[PDB]
Design a protein around this ligand. Structure first.
Ligand SMILES: CCC[n+]1ccccc1CC(P(=O)(O)O)P(=O)(O)O
Ligand SMILES: CCC[n+]1ccccc1CC(P(=O)(O)O)P(=O)(O)O
Ligand SMILES: [Mg+2]
Ligand SMILES: [Mg+2]
Ligand SMILES: [Mg+2]
Ligand SMILES: [Mg+2]
Ligand SMILES: [Mg+2]
Ligand SMILES: [Mg+2]
Lengths: 341, 338
């Protein structure tokens, strides 16, 4: 399977990180970073790294694909996985999270705490040593480095929208609109989750035409909105033993798809219940919100919107130039439709 | 000079917005502007100025133009933005309260731990500035790499700095550990980076000259961090802009390493009893010990011996690395009190 094949290269990636940096001189640190990386990359689906490799394989002419290019595609994919692990290490701090991939969040470990913020920088900086080690002498080098820095800017833009204390004042949820939601998810998720791995695949396949990149980017951004709606749903409704994480969107007062849809449907008296109980860690409050979501039929709306968006994404995919592989995108869509984690 | 450096700031802030996706999201562009202004305000701009001075003294006067001076300042501001980023995070890890005479960014009620996201916004900004001014230039990739390398070096050092003595075991508080901490956490980004950037802008690529420069820079940087450690304990907050935390955070400071060198058996038990505690009486008790051990006197003497050694080294550099630049840099910091 593609997953074990992708995972097979991880130990070699970790050595590359060391050997190509000053880490060679400070083994206390090189050994620590190994622990950081193994913990924060462990488990999960590897979906972003896979999407990188799948894109490359689907977009390149099969006659131009070599074992070396496959290793390079996996390497780019692992760089997205590292970015992911960095992003979620900080996100977990910001979101008051307790567990991820079925264990304590990195920052919750007693030996780590707030020094996680330095572990994050060590992870992020690893990326550029991988990129330099494999690509410095190639024409795509500066496209790669810029793409990963752009991804950091995009994601942080979206994270600011997400966590900003200005998103709500007390009982004022006037900013919980779809305009705000669309901005949040476009920036915090859609870019790094889809646009980045696909663009990386494209660059590796020597596709440079700005029109094709723009077309692929618009497709990606649509898929990533869809993907975050599913993330938000799962926060509320997912099975912890499958997702590996306790949901916190309700207690943290997030402008999640569910909150936005709930406000679409609240009666005047329901709106008061929402504003009273949303954003609180008391279990009775949290439960009251979930009951309200149920009364408002948000589970049925999700199922129907997931399908409508699904059908819309598939049609968009079929209308892409063949140079972008409609089939790749159809398959990416198919892989996440109906997911429960 | 400083104000001629500071005049360039409005164009940097403008570039950061317009060169990015920030143009579509004015809520975030306005926030980033506040983040930058607050975290770059005041201070000495020392690292930015080193960059500028390094270029001006390394390049032949016949090659310096108004446009290359602007580029040198721009690169200096990139270093200032890196500094801002690094200390934003450091202040979280060190439990600091103030910096530059105001609350540390993370202490602000509306920021908190979301400061970690503001740090990413700052770090990422650097690369838009480098792209705007340098993308079509040969040195571009070298500049991008130098910044990413600075992040790795600093984080390596920060790791050694923050990593969790055991209890009353201060066996690891040695000069070997100190030397590694400060080489990586300070000396690289504070001196090697700005000087390397000046060298690149002056088209100086000879690896031997880069090596000699680096070696000088690493010596200066250790020195600078010793002074920083001393200031944490003895500096006047109305000048430094910051409340000291090394004692209460149990840091492997120069002072602590030197204290251990001198402690009698009973002094050692006092040190292990009182170091690393937020209790005011415990902190003052460490300070009373430092005084008893004549650490202020030792610092004054060691600052002078290291200064003399630094100057001797600078005078012995190749002509093409500007002994005078280094003499100048060392004189700007010797005897500093913030
Ligand atoms: C699906 C990617 C979502 N995402 C984007 C940016 C940063 C972090 C995450 C992780 C998500 P999660 O994994 O549920 O904690 P979020 O906190 O709900 O947005
Ligand atoms: C002189 C640069 C010292 N430095 C290096 C790396 C990261 C942060 C700092 C800031 C220092 P400070 O300004 O005293 O908090 P440190 O925490 O004593 O080291
Ligand atoms: Mg989260
Ligand atoms: Mg989040
Ligand atoms: Mg979520
Ligand atoms: Mg500090
Ligand atoms: Mg520190
Ligand atoms: Mg200090």
């Amino acid at each position: 399977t593609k997953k074990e094949s992708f995972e097979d290269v991880l130990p070699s990636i970790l050595n590359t990180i060391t050997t190509n940096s000053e880490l060679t001189e400070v083994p206390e640190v090189a050994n620590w970073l190994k622990k950081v990386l193994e913990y924060n990359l462990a488990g999960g689906k590897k979906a972003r790294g896979l999407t990188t490799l799948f894109a490359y394989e689907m977009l390149e002419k099969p006659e131009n694909i070599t074992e070396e290019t496959i290793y390079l595609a996996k390497t780019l994919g692992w760089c997205v996985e590292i970015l992911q692990g960095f992003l979620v290490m900080l996100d977990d701090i910001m979101d008051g999270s307790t567990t991820r991939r079925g264990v304590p969040c990195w920052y919750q470990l007693p030996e780590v705490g707030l020094a996680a913020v330095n572990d994050s920088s060590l992870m992020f900086s690893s990326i550029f040593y991988v990129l330099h080690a494999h690509f410095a002498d190639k024409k795509i080098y500066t496209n790669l480095v810029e793409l990963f820095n752009e991804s950091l800017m995009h994601t942080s833009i979206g994270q600011h929208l997400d966590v900003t204390m200005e998103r709500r004042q007390k009982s004022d949820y006037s900013l919980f609109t779809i305009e705000r939601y669309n901005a949040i998810v476009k920036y915090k998720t859609a870019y790094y989750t889809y646009q980045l791995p696909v663009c990386l695949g494209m660059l590796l396949a020597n596709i440079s035409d700005p029109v094709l990149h723009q077309k692929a980017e618009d497709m990606c951004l649509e898929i990533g909105k869809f993907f975050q709606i599913q993330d938000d749903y799962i926060d509320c409704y997912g099975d912890e033993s499958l997702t590996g994480k306790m949901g916190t969107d309700i207690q943290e007062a997030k402008c999640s798809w569910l909150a936005v849809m709930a406000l679409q449907r609240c009666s005047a008296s329901q709106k008061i219940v929402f504003t009273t109980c949303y954003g609180s860690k008391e279990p009775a409050h949290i439960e009251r919100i979930k009951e309200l979501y149920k009364q408002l039929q948000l589970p049925e709306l999700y199922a129907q919107e997931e399908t409508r968006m699904y059908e819309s994404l598939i049609k968009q995919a079929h209308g892409l130039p063949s140079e972008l592989s409609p089939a790749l995108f159809v398959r990416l869509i198919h892989m996440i439709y109906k997911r429960n984690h």
